[PDB]
Structures are given as structure tokens and as C-alpha cells.
Design a protein around this ligand. Structure first.
Ligand SMILES: *[C@@H]1O[C@H](CO)[C@@H](O[C@@H]2O[C@H](CO)[C@@H](O[C@@H]3O[C@H](CO[C@H]4O[C@H](CO)[C@@H](O)[C@H](O[C@H]5O[C@H](CO)[C@@H](O)[C@H](O)[C@@H]5O)[C@@H]4O)[C@@H](O)[C@H](O[C@H]4O[C@H](CO)[C@@H](O)[C@H](O)[C@@H]4O[C@H]4O[C@H](CO)[C@@H](O)[C@H](O)[C@@H]4O[C@H]4O[C@H](CO)[C@@H](O)[C@H](O)[C@@H]4O)[C@@H]3O)[C@H](O)[C@H]2NC(C)=O)[C@H](O)[C@H]1NC(C)=O
Ligand SMILES: *[C@@H]1O[C@H](CO)[C@@H](O[C@@H]2O[C@H](CO)[C@@H](O[C@@H]3O[C@H](CO[C@H]4O[C@H](CO)[C@@H](O)[C@H](O[C@H]5O[C@H](CO)[C@@H](O)[C@H](O)[C@@H]5O[C@H]5O[C@H](CO)[C@@H](O)[C@H](O)[C@@H]5O)[C@@H]4O)[C@@H](O)[C@H](O[C@H]4O[C@H](CO)[C@@H](O)[C@H](O)[C@@H]4O[C@H]4O[C@H](CO)[C@@H](O)[C@H](O)[C@@H]4O)[C@@H]3O)[C@H](O)[C@H]2NC(C)=O)[C@H](O)[C@H]1NC(C)=O
Ligand SMILES: *[C@@H]1O[C@H](CO)[C@@H](O[C@@H]2O[C@H](CO)[C@@H](O[C@@H]3O[C@H](CO[C@H]4O[C@H](CO)[C@@H](O)[C@H](O[C@H]5O[C@H](CO)[C@@H](O)[C@H](O)[C@@H]5O)[C@@H]4O)[C@@H](O)[C@H](O[C@H]4O[C@H](CO)[C@@H](O)[C@H](O)[C@@H]4O[C@H]4O[C@H](CO)[C@@H](O)[C@H](O)[C@@H]4O)[C@@H]3O)[C@H](O)[C@H]2NC(C)=O)[C@H](O)[C@H]1NC(C)=O
Ligand SMILES: *[C@@H]1O[C@H](CO)[C@@H](O[C@@H]2O[C@H](CO)[C@@H](O[C@@H]3O[C@H](CO[C@H]4O[C@H](CO)[C@@H](O)[C@H](O)[C@@H]4O)[C@@H](O)[C@H](O[C@H]4O[C@H](CO)[C@@H](O)[C@H](O)[C@@H]4O[C@H]4O[C@H](CO)[C@@H](O)[C@H](O)[C@@H]4O)[C@@H]3O)[C@H](O)[C@H]2NC(C)=O)[C@H](O)[C@H]1NC(C)=O
Ligand SMILES: *[C@@H]1O[C@H](CO)[C@@H](O[C@@H]2O[C@H](CO)[C@@H](O[C@@H]3O[C@H](CO[C@H]4O[C@H](CO)[C@@H](O)[C@H](O)[C@@H]4O)[C@@H](O)[C@H](O[C@H]4O[C@H](CO)[C@@H](O)[C@H](O)[C@@H]4O[C@H]4O[C@H](CO)[C@@H](O)[C@H](O)[C@@H]4O)[C@@H]3O)[C@H](O)[C@H]2NC(C)=O)[C@H](O)[C@H]1NC(C)=O
Ligand SMILES: *[C@@H]1O[C@H](CO)[C@@H](O[C@@H]2O[C@H](CO)[C@@H](O[C@@H]3O[C@H](CO[C@H]4O[C@H](CO)[C@@H](O)[C@H](O)[C@@H]4O)[C@@H](O)[C@H](O[C@H]4O[C@H](CO)[C@@H](O)[C@H](O)[C@@H]4O)[C@@H]3O)[C@H](O)[C@H]2NC(C)=O)[C@H](O)[C@H]1NC(C)=O
Ligand SMILES: *[C@@H]1O[C@H](CO)[C@@H](O[C@@H]2O[C@H](CO)[C@@H](O[C@@H]3O[C@H](CO[C@H]4O[C@H](CO)[C@@H](O)[C@H](O)[C@@H]4O)[C@@H](O)[C@H](O[C@H]4O[C@H](CO)[C@@H](O)[C@H](O)[C@@H]4O)[C@@H]3O)[C@H](O)[C@H]2NC(C)=O)[C@H](O)[C@H]1NC(C)=O
Ligand SMILES: *[C@@H]1O[C@H](CO)[C@@H](O[C@@H]2O[C@H](CO)[C@@H](O)[C@H](O)[C@H]2NC(C)=O)[C@H](O)[C@H]1NC(C)=O
Ligand SMILES: *[C@@H]1O[C@H](CO)[C@@H](O)[C@H](O)[C@H]1NC(C)=O
Ligand SMILES: *[C@@H]1O[C@H](CO)[C@@H](O)[C@H](O)[C@H]1NC(C)=O
Ligand SMILES: *[C@@H]1O[C@H](CO)[C@@H](O)[C@H](O)[C@H]1NC(C)=O
Ligand SMILES: *[C@@H]1O[C@H](CO)[C@@H](O)[C@H](O)[C@H]1NC(C)=O
Ligand SMILES: *[C@@H]1O[C@H](CO)[C@@H](O)[C@H](O)[C@H]1NC(C)=O
Lengths: 453, 126, 126, 126, 48, 48
């Protein structure tokens, strides 16, 4: 009996940390969306009607969301998926032309600059033989003064080429699930006070993640899943100012956004098959794009982050909020899509506070672009067609990407500013619950047993 | 009782050696996205077959629990029976024996073919 | 006699249980078109392995016919031996037992691991 | 002694029948280039499974050496034991029996199912 | 040497108006054809 | 010195050396490159 023998085990519950290609899952209503619009919903496998996540009792697991792959994988999947969509969509090669632009029909005070330039230009025809002078409307940001005529050009003309998104497509973020292969598990930190790094007591295995819709947005991140108890403020290295802070809200703060102008679209035959969607007459008043949030709730929720922040910087500390320091329009402003057009909302009004140790709304203005250069584009750009009519969207704010000032001097007055830049932060914000592991079922261990002769 | 796939993670190696057919079960069945699906579909059978490969080059195609003829080198663990089967968990246990698992496998490989080369001689004379 | 792959379709479940090695045989071996070939080539091994998966999580890796220790719940069929083996065909028979095949499989899954956990105890004492 | 994968190429069929677990071992685990990798990754499991397919439709899922019930037709070789096991090599030996390997396999196929259909009758009466 | 094994004593409910391999084929033909034209020259300037 | 059919002149001869014979090569001119904007994104690299 004293002599022990190894006996092999198949089906042993043990895993090694891994990386692997996952795959997407979506629901039937995403295909019911039809209209040939949603990206990759079609090639994407379906979800489960009765999903199950088995809780694993008595086990702890060392998570780290700042050294994860499935957010790098996702970030990549999103960039690829998007870029494959633009291949069929028409090229605006000849739209790069010397425009002759003026201001839009308006009677505004001199201080208020003109942001809608009415531009006429020699465009191409269905026939190589001919040409056509035709006019369109452009935002001031989509053009640059070229040089007593007032002539302009599309801003991309010196940086990159341009390709018009098919209107028969949609930008709506629909929920994606990242399902593992066989013999691969995803482990889910069910602890409701986890900062994203270290041992998690409450853990569960699961095939696919939750419905993670790809909202690509700077400053405040929207429509995301929110915390269960406290407003959790997560970072890789909090002490170091170079690293950003991911704030995850507890309560949703609803923010309504809109383009008040009843814009119109005309279609211009580049020919043949090619067809540019110009911006036609503005029906009605010429107003300003903007977003509203409750000053009451913003007060309330900015009070929550401060209560949490003082747990890291001292009880007797001043924590005020300031606007962006300076940089690209991509990062100096709350960027998002709304109805199919891209927004650039001044966040100075939100981040303008001060906090001591112890009924209208916030109108915040916006800008709008059509030729966009997202994901740090370099050789290619994309013209987002005019969306006919009036546009308005309603969304919750789920989080923030804040940034602290490194001047320091041990001052109890370290202030914060909204940030963005790298878009992995957004998927980092939703994927903090998850980790991918490689299943290894072949156990070997001694029990008093010999195999027969 | 039925816990679920991996449910006996933090269970003792004795209790976890009950639910083996559950981890062994959910292990096979369950154009951008299209390629992801394909190199995940092969990865799962490659990874699966590599285990059946081992069980087969040993005598343990049964399988689950399979005894053998290579005796336990105390150097590998040296712990008593109770304190691994009624105490430790496989997550834990794996990291101890991890240093020699491939050396242990080699002992198994020779031992099986040795059985076959022998058993032919038995059926040969009888 | 040799009928052919699926030849005993309309044959009695007794006569069809003769030609099992023929259906089991023609089941593996046998850029537009190029992709079709690839997701058909994996589909065939995925579908094949999923059956070996079952036979293996039961005791029936033999295989073909394999007896077991789960007794026949009369509720499933309740027909007499003669009228299924010397009468009915598998096409027909499949649709009757179809309502509980996965429930039946579950009875098999627990029963096999139960055998193994037991047989270790025999070789342990002896 | 340990020669290496295929090392007993020019070794006698007896000595080469020792190192079987080495050739059986290095047989599974080990965008232009990306496609090459994929139709090589499937080719290896297809080719591998086609052998397990045969061993399984015979009784030899063991495997390595497996005896059977089909007697050796002298027409196939007719050479004496010594001059093939202690003399010839498998490279050589393969080309002799090559003319009837698939006919030999057929003898095996019927013989296995014949065993199963019989063994059920034994466990049936007992 | 193609072989089609007759299955004696069995009947099967066919429906050609609810088949796939014709939808599959129809598709294969359209794709196959459309992949052929990628290298073939564009008559863009012939529109004149 | 290897060949498919040495006797037949139509087939070439593959000579494989035993010793390396080092051969140094160069373009002595300090050439310069300017970049010409075809635009947009397109850019021809001229020889300056
Ligand atoms: C889409 O494509 C459209 C078609 O390509 C394009 O429309 C064209 O736009 C250009 C530029 O705006 C137009 O050119 C101008 O045309 C003016 C109108 O004159 C026409 O009609 C007259 C009768 O009323 C004719 O007399 C005249 O032709 C005569 O003059 C010629 C002069 O060389 C002569 O050679 C001919 O044989 C003939 O005798 C013409 O048919 C014309 O007046 C104008 O000349 C000056 O005046 C303009 C204002 O009216 C100024 O804007 C312009 O700058 C010119 O001043 C020049 O001279 C000054 C004094 O020397 C200089 O200080 C200036 O710098 C400037 O010099 C520049 O221009 C010279 C041209 O003469 C050039 O030679 C110099 O080297 C220097 O570069 C000018 O010719 C054209 O008519 C339009 N065509 C059509 C069909 O509409 C349109 O813009 C494109 N874009 C869009 C959005 O639609
Ligand atoms: C955070 O999350 C929130 C919450 O989801 C996000 O808000 C979304 O914003 C979207 C815009 O960005 C918005 O989508 C648009 O909605 C427009 C309004 O009309 C729709 O919604 C109303 C209700 O609000 C609904 O009643 C309409 O139709 C219903 O009924 C018809 C049948 O009559 C159904 O076919 C339809 O599915 C819908 O069914 C509903 O009612 C039945 C009962 O009758 C229920 O049983 C159902 O369950 C269901 O509730 C509209 O659906 C709408 O005008 C927009 O439509 C354009 O875009 C879509 C893109 O898919 C396209 O299909 C349309 O055809 C159209 O585009 C094309 O047509 C235009 C002219 O027609 C043309 O100009 C274009 O160029 C195109 O060619 C669009 O659907 C969405 O509704 C809201 N979410 C909700 C819940 O309302 C928010 O955006 C998120 N935040 C961020 C930052 O993204
Ligand atoms: C971002 O956008 C969202 C929405 O996109 C905003 O949220 C919305 O906020 C508004 C208010 O700001 C909410 O409206 C509220 O609705 C209440 C319920 O009304 C319903 O029930 C009553 C019966 O109690 C019905 O009679 C109503 O129907 C009648 O009214 C509609 C028009 O509203 C007509 O079309 C119908 O034909 C009916 O005539 C509704 O079905 C409502 O109680 C509330 O206030 C009313 O009552 C107070 C007195 O307490 C009045 O002073 C006030 O003027 C309202 O009076 C309406 O209702 C009475 C009956 O109660 C009628 O007799 C009147 O004629 C009048 O219609 C208020 O109207 C809305 O629900 C809410 N939506 C969501 C989704 O949250 C966010 O604020 C915005 N955020 C930011 C930051 O911008
Ligand atoms: C994101 O959002 C931020 C905040 O909204 C924004 O910063 C602001 O930018 C604007 C420029 O775009 C700054 O310019 C201000 O514009 C207003 C509007 O001008 C009208 O009124 C003046 C007279 O007041 C007229 O001459 C003019 O024609 C318009 O009718 C001006 O009013 C502002 O001037 C104030 O300061 C001057 C200098 O001190 C004073 O002389 C003047 O009277 C104004 O009053 C201020 O001073 C008074 C004492 O002298 C005091 O009593 C008042 O209360 C008041 O403080 C100014 O020129 C504006 O200043 C910026 N806001 C802040 C807080 O700095 C960002 O620009 C935006 N992001 C981007 C990218 O643009
Ligand atoms: C972020 O959000 C904040 C609100 O939270 C918003 O701040 C608003 O700023 C404007 C200015 O642009 C405020 O308007 C006035 O600001 C003056 C500033 O005075 C200072 O500077 C002068 C020199 O220019 C100094 O001489 C002076 O001492 C200050 O240092 C204030 O003085 C004004 O308040 C006076 O009036 C109040 C009402 O009577 C009094 O209660 C108050 O005590 C102030 O009186 C003082 O000054 C007098 C001389 O001016 C003096 O005679 C008195 O004895 C006394 O000392 C006034 O506030 C506006 O109020 C601010 N908003 C709020 C709610 O207070 C930012 O604009 C916003 N930023 C963005 C980008 O959105
Ligand atoms: C969050 O981020 C902060 C920083 O923002 C980190 O805090 C620092 O932590 C380190 C230790 O982990 C502290 O120690 C310092 O290390 C420096 C190392 O730099 C040397 O070595 C590199 C190696 O490549 C060289 O390239 C480089 O040139 C340096 O030679 C030292 O330089 C620091 O000073 C010491 O050395 C110099 C001589 O070089 C002496 O003159 C000094 O007196 C001193 O002996 C020092 O040792 C560092 O101080 C911390 N900084 C701050 C601001 O806190 C956190 O660790 C990080 N959090 C996590 C979890 O990682
Ligand atoms: C390296 O390459 C050399 C040639 O460069 C090869 O040397 C030749 O080898 C062949 C035999 O292998 C010698 O024999 C000659 O064969 C010819 C065959 O051609 C006839 O058949 C073809 C079949 O398709 C017809 O298309 C064609 O028109 C011919 O009808 C014969 O034609 C030669 O002449 C004989 O036939 C004629 C009548 O046709 C008579 O008049 C002649 O007298 C004679 O009987 C001859 O038989 C050939 O001579 C060799 N040539 C040289 C130059 O050496 C090597 O074999 C090759 N090495 C290797 C390893 O392959
Ligand atoms: C059209 O809009 C332009 C601005 O794009 C106007 O010109 C500028 O007006 C602002 C108003 O504050 C001044 O600060 C600038 O100095 C003006 N530009 C120049 C070069 O002086 C222009 O007046 C508008 N109207 C027309 C008819 O062009
Ligand atoms: C928060 O709301 C209260 C409500 O009166 C307001 O007085 C206060 O100024 C707000 N907080 C800050 C920092 O301004
Ligand atoms: C700050 O003080 C409050 C006082 O109620 C206390 O609850 C909290 O734990 C303190 N936090 C830190 C980080 O000192
Ligand atoms: C195995 O055990 C023996 C004694 O039982 C010991 O001498 C040997 O060193 C052990 N193996 C290893 C690798 O240590
Ligand atoms: C199985 O048979 C027993 C009696 O033999 C019966 O009580 C039971 O209901 C049957 N199972 C089902 C699912 O009906
Ligand atoms: C097999 O051997 C028998 C005699 O042992 C012989 O008659 C027969 O021809 C052989 N088979 C073949 C295919 O030659």
C-alpha cells in the first residue's frame, strides 16, 4: 500500500491563462434590422436563448484589465470590420477640387462666425466628355481656405483620400458578445467593488461576454453598463499622472443631443454608378447643435466621484474640475455619432467646478463634421453623407476618462481634466470583468492503484 | 448534485474527481467574423485531439481515471493521500507537479508499448 | 451480402444492425470553390468527433453495438423486442425515441464515470 | 535506446516494432502564409483520423500492435517469420503486401462487426 | 467509377420548391462569375 | 556541377562553389529624392 502509483485524470477542472481568437455573437433582432445596414451582424453567429454562467465557488482569480488581450482583439475587430465596409462605398476622388465658397443665407451678429459654407464647384459628369458646376454645403471644419475670390478645398485633400460611406449602412452600436472556442473559458469577476486588478473572490466561468456595444466616443463614454453599488474609479497607476482614470458611474445621467436644422440632401451623378450626396437647402432656421444634461444630476454625480477620489488623495483635499488643456478636436471635445453624423461638444461647462472637504439644464454646444478621420487615420478618410431631416438622440453617460495634473508640489489642490485619445480605454471600460483562459483537462496524480497484468 | 462546467474549481481533488464527465463534456461542440470562426473551430479539435493522443499512447483511452505501471516518484510531490484528495484542489495541485509532467508522460509512453510488445507474446504462446 | 452505404434504409433494425460497419465506413474521407471545400472538410470531422465524444463519455469506444447499465424506461417505447428488431426500421424507430434521446444520454454520462470511480477501488484493494 | 522519429527506418521489422510510440508521437502537434497554415492544419487531422478510423472499425483502438482473426493468406507474402521480423524492413515489407492491403482491410472490417454481433449474444444469455 | 446505391423499401418526401442546393447553386454561379471580372479591364472612359 | 541532362546542351548547368568568392558592388552617386504630391494620399518619389 505504501507504494503509490500515478493514475491519469481526464476532465480535471484546471486552466492556464491564455490568449486566443474569440468570436462574435449577436441576436435575431439585429438581423431583423435588415436594410443591409449593420456591420458584420450577418457573419456574426447568434446568441443563446437561455445563457448560463456557472459560478465557481471557493476560487479566487488574479485579474488585470490593463494587460488584457480581448480588448486589443476587439479594438482591432472594430477597426477592421469598419474598414472592410468602405471598400464598396464610393470614392470621392474628384471632389478634391478648388471650391468657390461663400456663407450661408443668414442674418447673425458679426461675433457669430459662419459655420455653413455654400460651395460651388466644377464636378465630373457621367460622361468623360463633360463637366458640371454644382453647389453643396460644407461645415467650416470640412474645408480650408486655399490661396479677390474666397476659394476653399476639402481638408483631406493634402492629408488623405476620401470615400463616401454607403447610406445603405448604419452606425448604430449594437451589442456584441465575445464567445470563446471549445476548451476555452471566460472568467467573470462578479465582485461589486473590484478595481480591475488583483485577486477576485467572486468568480464565474462563462462562454460569451455580455452585450458589449461599440460606442466610440471621447470624454464621456455613453450607454455602457453601470456599476452596482459605488462609482468605481479605476486606473493602471493612479499615482502617476501619465495614466488616465476610468470613472464608472453608479447612476445614469441622461444627456439629450440634437441637430436642430432640417437639412436636405441632393444626389449628384459622378457617373457611372458613382453618385455624390451633396448637402442641399436648409429648411427653416439656422440653429446650433448642442446637448443637454441635468445640472442637478451632474452636481449629484460629480459629488459621487469626489467622495471616491478622496479615498486616494486624502480626506482634507480640494478636487476641482477643469476643461481640456489642448490638442486635437478628436480629443478636446466630447465626440460621438448621433443619427448618422458626428458631433463635437464643448465640455467646458461640465468640467468647471471646485469641491471642499465638507430648474433648468446644462446647454452645451457642439460642432459637426462630414469628412472624418477617426482611429488616428493617415491615408484614408470617410465622408459621412448628409442625414436628411432633424436629428436628436437620447443617451446615458456611463463613465468618464479623466486626467490629473502632474504639477503636484504635494498640494491638496490636484485638479482633473477630461481625456481620450486611445480608444482601447472604452473597451477596457466594459471588458474589465473578463479574462480568457486555456483549459487543460489532463490531470495526473497518485492513488494506490496499479493497472492489471 | 450537478454544479456546472468548472463548478468544482475550488473543490477538493476527490470531489472534483467526481465531476470529470462535465468538463470532458463541454469541450467540443460547446467575411471578417468568418475567419475567426474557422481558426477557432480547428483550434478546438487540435487541442482536443492532442489529449486523446496522449491517452492513446498510454493505455487510457477509457478514459477519465486510468491507473498505470509507473510508480510515483516521491520527489514530484511526496505529500500524503489525504492531503491531496481530501484537501488540495487541482488548480493548486497542478502547479506542484508542473515541473515534471512531460518527464512523467515519457515514463508512460515507454510503459504502454512495453505492455503491448508483451501481451502479443502471451496470445502467441496461448 | 453487401448492399451499400445506407442500403439497409428500409431494412429491419435487426438486418440493419448487421451493416453498421458500412455506414461507419463512408463517413470521413468519403478561390471560390476553395473555401467551400474547407468549411466542409472541418464540418465532417467536427460532426464525426461529436459522436466519438459521446461513445467515449459512455463506455462504448468499441464500438458499434455497446450494452450499458441504464435500464430501458418503458415510457420511451414500451414495444416488444420482436416488433422493433424483426419489424421496425431505424428511420421509423428514431422518431419514437427522439423525444428523450438527450435525456437518455444523460443517464449514460453519469453511469460511466460511476463505473470508473468504482473500478479504481477494485484495483486499489487488489 | 532512443533513436528518433523514423530512426528505425533501416532497422529490422522486429527492432522497428519496438519504436512505434515515437512515430505515433510526432504525428499531430508536431495573409499568404496564413492560408498555407490552415489547409496543413486540417490535412494533419484528416490524415490522422483516417487511421484511427481504421483501427476503430477493426478492434485495434489500443493500439500499436493488435492481433486479429483473419488468417494470413500465404499468397500475400508466404515468407517465414524470421526473414521478415529479424530480416526485412517495413519500407521493404510495405511494397510486397501493398497489392492487397485494401483487400486485407476488408477482411478485417467484417470480422470486427461479426465479433460485436456475437458478443452481445453472450452478455444476452449471461 | 461513380456509384449510386439504391435504397430498397424506403420512401422520401421531396420538395423541389423548398430546396437549398438550387439557392446555393444560383449563388455559386453569381459569385463565381463576379470574381472573374475583377482582373478584366474597366471601360470607365468608354462612357463618352 | 549539377544538371538534369548534361549531354544535352538545352539543359543548363548548376555550378555550386566550394569556396566563397566575395564580390563588392556599388552605386557611387550620392543620389537625392524629392517627393511629388499626386494627391490626395498618392505621392510620387522623384529622383532629385
Ligand atoms: C469651373 O470651370 C469654369 C471654366 O473653366 C471656370 O470659369 C472660368 O473662370 C475663369 C476665372 O474666374 C474666367 O476667366 C476670367 O474671365 C473673365 C471674363 O472675361 C471673359 O469675357 C470677356 C467679355 O466680357 C472676354 O473679353 C474675355 O476674353 C478676352 O480676354 C482674354 C484675356 O487674356 C483674351 O486672351 C481673350 O482672347 C479675349 O480677348 C473672357 O472670355 C475675364 O475678365 C478674366 O480676366 C481678368 O478679369 C477677371 C475679372 O473679370 C479677373 O478675375 C482675372 O484675374 C483677370 O485679371 C487678370 O488681369 C489683371 C491685369 O493684367 C491681372 O492683374 C490679374 O492678376 C489677372 O491676371 C491673371 O489672369 C489672366 C487672364 O486674362 C492670365 O492671363 C494671367 O496670366 C493671370 O493668371 C478672366 O479671363 C473664365 O472666363 C471662366 N470661364 C467660364 C466659361 O465661365 C470656373 O471658375 C470654375 N469653377 C467654378 C466654381 O465654376
Ligand atoms: C443609446 O441608446 C439609445 C436607445 O437605443 C439610442 O437611441 C436611439 O437613437 C437612434 C438614432 O441614433 C434611433 O434610431 C432612429 O429612430 C428614428 C425614430 O423612429 C424609430 O423609433 C420609433 C420609436 O422611437 C419607432 O416607433 C419607429 O418605428 C417603429 O414602428 C415601425 C413600424 O411602424 C417598425 O418598423 C420599427 O422597428 C419600430 O418598431 C417599434 O414599434 C413596435 C410597435 O409598433 C414595437 O413592437 C417594436 O418593438 C419597436 O419598438 C422607428 O423605429 C428613425 O426615424 C430612424 O430610422 C432611420 O434609421 C434606421 C436605421 O436602422 C433605418 O432603418 C430607417 O429606415 C431610417 O433610415 C433610412 O430612412 C430615412 C428616411 O426614412 C433616410 O433619411 C435615411 O437616410 C435611411 O435611408 C432610426 O431608426 C433609435 O430609435 C433610438 N433608440 C430608441 C429605443 O428609440 C442612442 O442613440 C444611444 N446612444 C448613442 C450615442 O448611440
Ligand atoms: C431628455 O428627453 C426626455 C424625453 O425624450 C425627457 O424626459 C421627459 O420629460 C417630460 C417632462 O419634462 C416627461 O413628460 C411628463 O409626462 C407626465 C405623464 O404624462 C402622461 O400622463 C398624463 C396623465 O397623467 C397624460 O394626460 C399625458 O398625455 C397628455 O399629454 C400629451 C403631451 O404631453 C398629449 O399629447 C396627450 O394627448 C395628453 O393630452 C401623458 O400620457 C406628466 O405628468 C408630466 O407633467 C404634466 O403634469 C404637470 C402637472 O403635474 C403639468 O404641469 C405639465 O404641463 C404636464 O401636463 C401634461 O399632462 C397633463 C395630465 O397630467 C395634461 O392634461 C396636459 O395637457 C399636459 O399634456 C410631464 O409632461 C416625459 O415623460 C419624460 N420622458 C422620459 C422618457 O423620461 C428628459 O427630461 C430630457 N432630459 C434632458 C436633460 O434634456
Ligand atoms: C468652449 O467653451 C468655452 C466657454 O464657453 C469657450 O471659451 C470662451 O470663448 C469665447 C470666444 O469664442 C470667449 O470670448 C468671449 O465672448 C463674449 C461674447 O462677446 C459678446 O459680448 C462682447 C462684450 O461683452 C461684445 O463685444 C461682442 O461683440 C459680443 O456681443 C464676450 O462677452 C467676452 O468678453 C468678456 O470679457 C472681456 C474682457 O474681460 C470684457 O471686456 C467683456 O465685457 C466680457 O465681459 C467679461 O468681463 C467683464 C468685466 O470687464 C465682467 O463683468 C463679465 O462678467 C465678463 O466676465 C469674451 O470676449 C470667452 O471669454 C471664453 N470663455 C471663457 C470663460 O473664457 C471656448 O472657446 C470653447 N471652445 C472653443 C474651442 O472655442
Ligand atoms: C464656470 O462656472 C462658474 C460658476 O460656478 C462661472 O463663473 C461666473 O463668472 C462670471 C465672471 O466671468 C461671474 O460674474 C461676476 O464675476 C465677478 C468677478 O470679480 C472678480 O474679478 C474682479 C476683477 O475683474 C475683482 O475685482 C473681484 O474682486 C473678483 O476677484 C464677481 O465679482 C461678480 O460677483 C460680484 O457680485 C455678486 C452679486 O452681488 C456678489 O455677491 C459678489 O461678492 C461679487 O461682488 C464682489 O465684487 C465687487 C466688484 O466686482 C465688489 O465691489 C464686492 O464688494 C465684492 O467683493 C460676478 O460673480 C459669475 O457670477 C460667475 N458665476 C457664478 C454663479 O458666480 C464660469 O463662467 C463658468 N465657466 C465656464 C467656462 O462655463
Ligand atoms: C506609478 O508611477 C510612479 C512614477 O510616476 C512610480 O513611482 C516611482 O517608483 C520608483 C520605484 O519603482 C521610484 O524609484 C526611482 O527609480 C528611478 C529609476 O530610474 C533609474 O533607472 C532607469 C533604468 O532604466 C534609468 O533609465 C534612469 O535614468 C535612472 O537611472 C531612480 O532614478 C530614482 O532616483 C534614484 O536614483 C538617482 C540616481 O539615478 C538618485 O539621485 C536618487 O536620489 C534616487 O536614489 C528612484 O529610485 C520613484 O521615485 C517613484 N516615483 C514617483 C514619482 O513616485 C510607481 O512605482 C508606479 N506604480 C506602480 C504600481 O508601478
Ligand atoms: C539527353 O538528351 C539527349 C538528346 O539531346 C538524349 O540522347 C538521345 O537519346 C535517344 C534515345 O533515348 C537517341 O535515340 C534517337 O531517338 C530519336 C527518337 O525520335 C523519334 O521518335 C519521336 C517520338 O515522338 C518522333 O517524334 C521523332 O520524329 C522521331 O521519329 C530517333 O529519331 C533517333 O534516330 C533514329 O530514327 C531515325 C528515323 O526516325 C533513323 O533514321 C536513325 O538512323 C535512328 O535509327 C534516335 O533513335 C538519340 O540519338 C540521342 N541523341 C543524342 C544527341 O545523344 C539522352 O538520352 C538524354 N539523356 C537522358 C538521361 O535522357
Ligand atoms: C462671411 O464669413 C466670413 C468669416 O468666415 C466673414 O469675414 C470675417 O468676419 C469676422 C467676423 O467677426 C471677422 O472677425 C473677420 O475678420 C472677417 N474676415 C476678414 C478676412 O476680414 C464675412 O464678413 C462673411 N460675409 C461675407 C459676405 O463674406
Ligand atoms: C451643487 O448644487 C448646489 C445646489 O444649490 C449648488 O449650490 C452648488 O454650487 C453645486 N456645486 C458646485 C460645486 O457648484
Ligand atoms: C475619509 O473620512 C471619512 C469620514 O467619514 C471616512 O469614512 C473615510 O473612510 C475616510 N477615507 C480616507 C481614505 O481616509
Ligand atoms: C525518485 O525517487 C528516488 C528514491 O525513491 C530518488 O532517488 C530519485 O532522486 C527520485 N527522482 C528524482 C528525479 O529526484
Ligand atoms: C419510467 O418507468 C417508471 C416505471 O417503470 C415510470 O414510473 C416512469 O414514469 C417512467 N419514466 C417516465 C419519464 O415516464
Ligand atoms: C489464399 O490461400 C489459399 C490456400 O491457403 C489459396 O487457395 C488462395 O488462392 C489464396 N488467396 C489468393 C488471393 O491467392
Amino acid at each position: 500500500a505504501e507504494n503509490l502509483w500515478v493514475t491519469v485524470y481526464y476532465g480535471v477542472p484546471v486552466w492556464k491563462d491564455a490568449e486566443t481568437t474569440l468570436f462574435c455573437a449577436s441576436d435575431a433582432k439585429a438581423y431583423e434590422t435588415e436594410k443591409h445596414n449593420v456591420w458584420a451582424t450577418h457573419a456574426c453567429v447568434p446568441t443563446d436563448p437561455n445563457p448560463q454562467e456557472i459560478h465557481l465557488e471557493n476560487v479566487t482569480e488574479e485579474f488585470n484589465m490593463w494587460k488584457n488581450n480581448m480588448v486589443e482583439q476587439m479594438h482591432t475587430d472594430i477597426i477592421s470590420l469598419w474598414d472592410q465596409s468602405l471598400k464598396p462605398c464610393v470614392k470621392l476622388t474628384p471632389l478634391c477640387v478648388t471650391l468657390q465658397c461663400t456663407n450661408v443665407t443668414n442674418n447673425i451678429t458679426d461675433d457669430m462666425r459662419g459655420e455653413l459654407k455654400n460651395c460651388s464647384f466644377n464636378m465630373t459628369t457621367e460622361l468623360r466628355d463633360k463637366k458640371q458646376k454644382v453647389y453643396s454645403l460644407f461645415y467650416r471644419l470640412d474645408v480650408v481656405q486655399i490661396n479677390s475670390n474666397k476659394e476653399y478645398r476639402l481638408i483631406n485633400c493634402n492629408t488623405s483620400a476620401i470615400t463616401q460611406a454607403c447610406p445603405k449602412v448604419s452606425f448604430e452600436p449594437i451589442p456584441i458578445h465575445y464567445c470563446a472556442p471549445a476548451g476555452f473559458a471566460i472568467l467573470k469577476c462578479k465582485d461589486k467593488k473590484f478595481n480591475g486588478t488583483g485577486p477576485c473572490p467572486s468568480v464565474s466561468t462563462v462562454q460569451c461576454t455580455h452585450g458589449i456595444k461599440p460606442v466610440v466616443s471621447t470624454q464621456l463614454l455613453l450607454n455602457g453598463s453601470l456599476a452596482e453599488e459605488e462609482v468605481m474609479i479605476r486606473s493602471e497607476n493612479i499615482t502617476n499622472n501619465a495614466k488616465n482614470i476610468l470613472v464608472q458611474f453608479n447612476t445614469p445621467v441622461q444627456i439629450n443631443c440634437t441637430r436642430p436644422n432640417n437639412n436636405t440632401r441632393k444626389s449628384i451623378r459622378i457617373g457611372p454608378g458613382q453618385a455624390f450626396y451633396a448637402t442641399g437647402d436648409i429648411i427653416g432656421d439656422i440653429r446650433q447643435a448642442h446637448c443637454n444634461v441635468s445640472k442637478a444630476t451632474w452636481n449629484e454625480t460629480l459629488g459621487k466621484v469626489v467622495k471616491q477620489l478622496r479615498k486616494h488623495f486624502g480626506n482634507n483635499t480640494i478636487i476641482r474640475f477643469a476643461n481640456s488643456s489642448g490638442g486635437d478636436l478628436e480629443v478636446t471635445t466630447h465626440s460621438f455619432n448621433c443619427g448618422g453624423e458626428f458631433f463635437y461638444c464643448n465640455t467646458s461647462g461640465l468640467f468647471n467646478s471646485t469641491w471642499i472637504s465638507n430648474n433648468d439644464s446644462i446647454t452645451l454646444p457642439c460642432r459637426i463634421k462630414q469628412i472624418i478621420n477617426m482611429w488616428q487615420r493617415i491615408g484614408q478618410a470617410m465622408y459621412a453623407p448628409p442625414i436628411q431631416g432633424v436629428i436628436r438622440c437620447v443617451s446615458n453617460i456611463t463613465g468618464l476618462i479623466l486626467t490629473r495634473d502632474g504639477g503636484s508640489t504635494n498640494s491638496t489642490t490636484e485638479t482633473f481634466r477630461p481625456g481620450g485619445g486611445d480608444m482601447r480605454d472604452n473597451w477596457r471600460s466594459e471588458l474589465y470583468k473578463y479574462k480568457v483562459v486555456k483549459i487543460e483537462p489532463l490531470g495526473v496524480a497518485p492513488t494506490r492503484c496499479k493497472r492489471r497484468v | 448534485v450537478f454544479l456546472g462546467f468548472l463548478g468544482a474549481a475550488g473543490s477538493t481533488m476527490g470531489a472534483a474527481s467526481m465531476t470529470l464527465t462535465v468538463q470532458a463534456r463541454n469541450l467540443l461542440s460547446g467575411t471578417v467574423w468568418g475567419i475567426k470562426q474557422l481558426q477557432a473551430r480547428v483550434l478546438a479539435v487540435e487541442r482536443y485531439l492532442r489529449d486523446q493522443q496522449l491517452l492513446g499512447i498510454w493505455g487510457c483511452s477509457g478514459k477519465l481515471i486510468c491507473c498505470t505501471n509507473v510508480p510515483w516518484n516521491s520527489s514530484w510531490s511526496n505529500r500524503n493521500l489525504s492531503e491531496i484528495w481530501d484537501n488540495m484542489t487541482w488548480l493548486q495541485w497542478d502547479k506542484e507537479i508542473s515541473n515534471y509532467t512531460q518527464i512523467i508522460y515519457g515514463l508512460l509512453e515507454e510503459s504502454q508499448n512495453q505492455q503491448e510488445k508483451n501481451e502479443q507474446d502471451l496470445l502467441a504462446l496461448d
